[model samples]
Target chain A: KFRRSGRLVDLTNYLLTHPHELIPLTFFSERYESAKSSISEDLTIIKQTFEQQGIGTLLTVPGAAGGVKYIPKMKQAEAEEFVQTLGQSLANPERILPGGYVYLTDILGKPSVLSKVGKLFASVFAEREIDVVMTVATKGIPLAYAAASYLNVPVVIVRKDGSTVSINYVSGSSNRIQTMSLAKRSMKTGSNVLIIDDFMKAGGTINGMINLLDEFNANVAGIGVLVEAEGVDERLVDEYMSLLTLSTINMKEKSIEIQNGNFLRFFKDN
Target chain B: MKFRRSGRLVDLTNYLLTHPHELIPLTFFSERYESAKSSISEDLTIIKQTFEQQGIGTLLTVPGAAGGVKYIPKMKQAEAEEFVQTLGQSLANPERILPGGYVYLTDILGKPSVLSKVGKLFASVFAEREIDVVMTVATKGIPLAYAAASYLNVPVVIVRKDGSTVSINYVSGSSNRIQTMSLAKRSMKTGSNVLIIDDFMKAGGTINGMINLLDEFNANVAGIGVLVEAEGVDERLVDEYMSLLTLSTINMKEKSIEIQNGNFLRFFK
Candidate 1:
């Protein structure tokens, strides 16, 4: 399955880079010397996967002036800003609290903040090397999707919990309560992966993600977080970026401090 | 607090359109006659909100001779297309089948497919308005952001989910769930408004977070939308965004799912 998938990806890339100048599916089908249905199937899978991955775009026009074309979306400047902003945001002191966590719901929810954060991340990895953006289901999906969009890569969500036939009825009602379920499903092996999250406290969830990535023999390109809690530096990641830094937190005092020094210096200096 | 968030929105829109020139913190304070500190803070909130809500560009101060906020309009079509094409391919898959029934995720995720689809759609409604940035949550959120960003010619972001506590034990032991989570801990300055998006839906927890996130920033959620919806998700809280597809329930036993193409494609022209 992996080999076939790879070949299909290669063929898609070839067609995308080379414009079809009035060639039909039939022409390509004859060249490949496979059944029309097989050829079409390959095209469908390739095109669909391209869109899913966010690497390149596939356009199928009906009448005339129609064939497949690929376009690259990310730029280097944009990528740099994305990593920088996210790193700074994650490094704030106000982001940390007594219980040992960082708060990032505010930044992720703000369209303006997220837009810059997302675009910057997308731009950094705009090259065609990354096959997919992988994250645990739910929170990570949005960031993965944003980065994927800039890179034109497809995003796949890995479910944190597994589902059984019996759990369907109960699962509907208990949707919010199924927090302990660490369901793992869906990810391609040997693919280059970028991991992103809303917040990093102890980095356990990310650890689980790393384990999963290891399972597929996938490469971990980088880790990104929107906010990082203080006192958790012992669990810090090596090649990670945070948008803000949180140095202190007093739950009772409700007092916090935020430093834009890292973010400002990084992007502004450049 | 009584000040209408929308009022700030209007003033922001007017200011950016009128002054293509970038203004500094002092200038905004002088213009508004408020405390320089308050004015600068509020102005940042307003400008950022405007960028997010409309996909317009915000000016940054250089801190020296070039110091001031410069309002760059959605300046490049090629850049927008580049972003859209990047996001479009995510929807073109043929093997995204789920149990019970669901539409394949390909069409909606396709690059130029979703880009042109969403760009034309949003452009139809917001063609005359100035937008700042496109915003959504992580993972599935990017495609919609890509579409909106492309049309508006703005940047986008995917909000990550945050844990409630600072204790490593709390985070280490707790199960990972996808409810409305935010990675950024700051609030929008008192009066920013914004748009929101998602890919698929179950309970709309993420959307709720997006709304609350904006509120924290004192920004209003200008609108909300999803690419697809699960069988029965609560959608009453938001203004329905044009969905690319609508999904029915998934039956694991039957191994079947149902997906219907949305009205978004038809609205293209």
Candidate 2:
């Protein structure tokens, strides 16, 4: 039904969009009205380009139901460069606000930045078996959605204003008691969930999400953050990855210092 | 180095995905791959056909040297309708009904799979429009705004309910209460074309507020799009907008909801 070039283009598009999904060779053979051998050759071409271009890797499952799976990833150097760029962007003194609160809304609002950040997080957590990426609203929603997009998983948002199951947790930065909630139908019980956020200080909000997940009987697959404040004493969550660490926000000097976190080191470079 | 058609197809598809809605000259591809113009055209033809067949988008080839191939993200009518149908079913669930007669849309809006599709559909509806940036009020609408903006290959400017320097007070269309919304002075450029996106629309006070706020920045309201629009509104503040689904009825007592497709299909024709 389709020519060889058409089949090649269509197959590349399909694999790129449907990352993490296993597509049987028989499915493509029937799709292009071609033989299994031809489809295999097409897959090989796509696989080579995908790897060479640093898009990701295409794994072949060997079995009766064997198929190809596209695992989304980013090049280590590119990811570091992106994080460095973010560090520089955040270092802008104009982003400084009253009481040392950084203005991150503009950066978080950028779809392009989030797309890259999402891929970075997805690349780091590519090996983890995650069923859902969880985050608390309102700021963390975009970051969670970004990571989820790359992870090929659904995002379950926990809201502070409303949820069926509400829990009161102390704000990590402000130390103020706040109410957070999650819909009962948000996630399935016994599911593996990855928690993602934009900024973390005391890890209270992330901890609250973990507690809320307990109510749903879900397991914490992993945690990811875009920025973490370094001065926090006695942090609640120990095992997590952050893109940048806000070391110092010198209001008087009008200088901000941001450095890469343990994300690069812990990034299972494969 | 000259590349074969197989290598060209993969790289071309990748290029199109990364640079959606942007024109890439055929000569640029031919020169880069060291291939003939005729061969590059054939490769583009294959890419275009494959894109159309995937229902993800299509590549439009413009005439002349200045005119190259533009990858416009879109959703096919059949796929769009089917997606909306299932989305309506998700909305019609009684469990989604909150205590205050509001629907809990967090689940649907939160999911990446859902947002991407919603983005694709909205992107398709407003595919031809010249949109510079996507705007939405803080919190709920942020993800939806990003979803559409990503497909459109534009930046998103979020208006916070709470101000940098220039803030405007507008009457809430549904609540009739005056509230102020603000955006960073540098968030958007002056005289830019903006696309307004929201998750839910009732009286469209929020959308109207966004339009008013955009005026402070000297930005233009190119278009408006929402995930769901409520019916039986005697007075609608904003007109000429696109919605993916319409909430016709929400019977509180009976614990039932009625959801239907928006005027999305008619725009395609």
Candidate 3:
């Protein structure tokens, strides 16, 4: 009922919207009213085009129930190009604050930037088993949703200030009691969570989240931060990925130093 | 050098996803692919047909040298109906009823898939209208606003509770207490059309607060979208807006919650 060109267009559109989802080959054949042979040939075209454009890769599973899975990813060269430019943009002296804090709200609010960051984070954890993405309310919300979009998972937000579970932890920078809360049942027990945040100063907030997960009986699948500041003694959490590292801030000189984080290590082979 | 038809489809699809609501001159694609103008047109025909065939979206072709094509994200009528049905069922769960009969909805709001569909719904509804910026208060509203703004291809203007050089004091409808919200004047250009998005609306005090702030910047409230609206308010402050769901009853004793589809049907019609 459908021509090859039309099926290719429809198939590509379906995969693009349904990232990280598995579709049985029969579904396409039935939808297009075409034979399995035609569907297979069309998929070959889509898979090839996807890889050639660096959009992502399609994995085929052979069996009665097996189908194809499209994994959205960012290429290594593209990731490096973005991170390099991001580091430079962050190094601007104007981003400096009085207590050596960096202003990053403007960067977090941009949808285009968040999309790239989300896809990059998704690419890093593409091969891992992640059920849920977690982040604190307000600042980290956008970034969490961005990555969650690509990962095809639900996001659970921990409130900074809930029925509600609350935890009081010492703020690493201020050494004050900072309480965060989340409504009970916000997340299921035993869910594997990938924690994401906009920035990490002393990893206090992230560590607090790890502790809070215990109350819900959730496991930390992984952790990701867009920007992590250095020079903190006794970093709270280990085994995390960050896109950029804040090396130093010379307040009097009005300058800041930034470097690419260990995230590139994941793609060293590419 | 020429690109095969398959390569053109992939690249074009990627370009459309990366750049939504943007006009691309056909000349740009023709020159890039080293293909004839008619070939590019034929390729777009396939893309457009497929996009509409599946509720993914539709391409608007503009005729003339200055125009090319723009992709507008929209959900098909049946698809939206099914989604709303599932969404209403999700909210209808009595377990979502927190203490004091307040429904817990963060879990739903935090879902990227749900947010993406919701965003597409709002973007599709407001696509015809001119929207220069999407505005919302800090915290819960950020995700919904960000999702919609991504589809609309506009910057988000977040109104924060913290103090700023310019701030406004208003009475929160639910709390009935005075609260302050701040916005940096530089966030918006004068006379821009802004789409106000929020996760919930009770007294509409927060929405009203946003409107007051918009007045200071000389911006227009182009549209208003609320994911959930609480019913049975003594007096509603703002009237003109769109809501996806309406929460009418919350009987904690009975362990019951009632959520119905709102005026979202207006958009479909």
Best by lDDT: 3
Model 2 vs. true fold: TM? 0.93
Q: TM-score per model for chain B alone?
A: 0.50, 0.92, 0.94
Q: Give the higher-TM-score candidate: 1 or 3.
A: 3
Looking at candidate 2, what is the lDDT of residue B17?
A: 89
Query: Per-residue lDDT of A136-244 in model 3, one digit per residue for the tens?
Result: 8778888898899888899988888737888888764688889999877688889889999988887889988999999998888888999888854258545788889
DockQ winner between candidates 1 and 3? 3
How do the residues B2-32 of candidate 3 rate in per-residue lDDT, one tens digit apiece? Answer: 7799878877877887788988898888987
The 10-residue segment with the lowest total lDDT in model 3 chain B: B231-240
* Full candidate order by TM-score, most accurate first: 3, 2, 1
Identify the superior model by lDDT, candidate 2 or candidate 3: 3
TM-score (0 to 1) for chain A, all models? 0.53, 0.95, 0.95
Clashes of each: 101, 0, 0
Compared with the true structure, the alpha-carbon lDDT of candidate 1 equals 0.50
Model 2 clash pairs are none
Cα error of candidate 2 at position A214, Å: 2.5
Candidate 2 local lDDT, A1-270, one digit each (tens) = 888888888888888878878889889989999998898988899888888878999898877589999998888889889999999999999888655567897788778899898988898888889999998877888888889888888888887883378778888557779988877877788989999998887778888888888898889988889998886535764478889998757868888889987787765552
Query: What DockQ does each listed candidate score?
Result: 0.07, 0.74, 0.69
Query: Residue pairs in steric clash, candidate 3?
Result: none
